[PDB]
């Protein structure tokens, strides 16, 4: 009984931490820019 | 099988990238500092 | 009926063989993930 | 005879649960390992 119980403990904890896995994967996937303004600054000058 | 072995091939590619990034952490220890 | 039985038993035999191969390929996944773990752990201190 | 039969059946159940444990928490470790990977990647991005 102890081993069945702690299996399923691990299973639910893994489900939660995989949902956090997905949260952060999509966070990063959704997630030189300071050069162009200066480029145009010269070009203008 | 094929999917699991895909896990393995992706893990191998990730391991190669891991060695590259380990060198880079041993390598990239400079770039920001030199301009800073 | 002869062919039916001969195919039915082969079903289970190959089912078990591919079960064992699945177990081994799980082991391979885990070991490659272990090497990745070691690489990132080493980079941790670097 | 019957009591020892029950003994051994439950012991085998124990052991198979233990193998479940091992593979399961290996998956859990993979979970959290990816969690930290994506957290760093999110921070960078």
From TrEMBL, chain A:
This is Coiled-coil protein, putative. The lineage of its organism: Eukaryota, Sar, Alveolata, Ciliophora, Intramacronucleata. The chain holds residues 448 to 497 of 893 of the full protein.
From TrEMBL, chain D:
It comes from the Eukaryota. This is Flagella associated protein. The chain holds residues 483 to 527 of 963 of the full protein.
């Amino acid at each position: 009984a102890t081993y069945e119980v702690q299996i399923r403990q691990g299973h639910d904890l893994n489900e939660k931490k995989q949902h956090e896995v997905g949260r952060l994967n999509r966070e990063h996937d959704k997630l030189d820019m300071s050069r162009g303004p200066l480029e145009a600054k010269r070009n203008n000058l | 099988t094929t999917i699991i072995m895909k896990h393995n091939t992706f893990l191998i590619f990730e391991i190669n990238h891991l060695k590259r990034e380990k060198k880079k952490i041993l390598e990239d220890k400079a770039k920001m500092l030199m301009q800073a | 009926e002869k062919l039916v039985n001969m195919f039915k038993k082969s079903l289970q035999k190959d089912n078990q063989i591919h079960k064992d191969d699945k177990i081994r390929i799980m082991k391979d996944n885990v070991d490659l993930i272990r090497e990745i773990n070691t690489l990132r752990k080493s980079i941790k201190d670097i | 005879q019957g009591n020892m039969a029950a003994c051994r059946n439950l012991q085998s159940h124990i052991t198979k649960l233990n193998q479940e444990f091992q593979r399961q928490q290996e998956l859990l470790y993979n979970a959290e390992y990816q969690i930290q990977l994506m957290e760093r990647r999110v921070a960078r991005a």
